[PDB]
Design a protein around this ligand. Structure first.
Ligand SMILES: COc1ccc(C(F)(F)F)cc1NC(=O)N1CCC[C@H](C(N)=O)C1
Ligand SMILES: [Zn+2]
Length: 139
């Protein structure tokens, strides 16, 4: 679990979104596993605007942060789950690191700010849904 709070927006994994998230829907993209809902309270996370390939993510299944090198956002094949059939997920970045399903939502950050959130994993790899291209999150 986990979310990004920036301005009047809440960014979560689309497969973990709640009824309140869907009743206050701003945008969602199943191909990215992202959903953005509106909030009453103001958010203070800074979204990074860069092409960094190094950062640190929070791994709830170890209660620890890990430094990682990660790939550029791209279309990557993702195994079927109870949330989606087998498909290409877009804007996904992979790193070598530990992750379990409940780790989704953990933030990946670089020196510039929030890069994305844990969205996939398996086989000693962890995948992050990028949010750096969502320029509208700031306005
Ligand atoms: C952080 O996620 C995991 C981490 C590790 C493993 C394991 F196979 F090793 F057990 C599995 C997962 N689960 C996932 O990758 N997904 C299930 C939830 C929906 C995700 C999506 N974006 O389509 C895909
Ligand atoms: Zn950066």
């Amino acid at each position: 679990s986990g979310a990004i709070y920036v301005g009047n927006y809440r960014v979560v994994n689309r497969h973990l979104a709640t009824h309140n998230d869907w009743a206050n829907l701003v945008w969602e993209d199943s191909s990215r596993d992202l959903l953005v809902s509106s909030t009453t309270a103001q958010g203070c996370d800074t979204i990074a605007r860069c092409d960094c390939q190094t950062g640190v993510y929070y791994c709830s299944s170890r209660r620890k942060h890990y430094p990682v090198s990660f790939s550029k956002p791209s279309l990557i094949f993702v195994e079927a789950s109870e949330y989606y059939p087998a498909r290409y997920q877009s804007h996904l970045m992979l790193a070598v690191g530990h992750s379990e399903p409940g780790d989704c939502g953990g933030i990946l950050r670089c020196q510039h700010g929030v890069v994305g959130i844990v969205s996939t994993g398996g086989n000693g790899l962890v995948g992050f849904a990028d949010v750096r291209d969502l320029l509208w999150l700031d306005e």
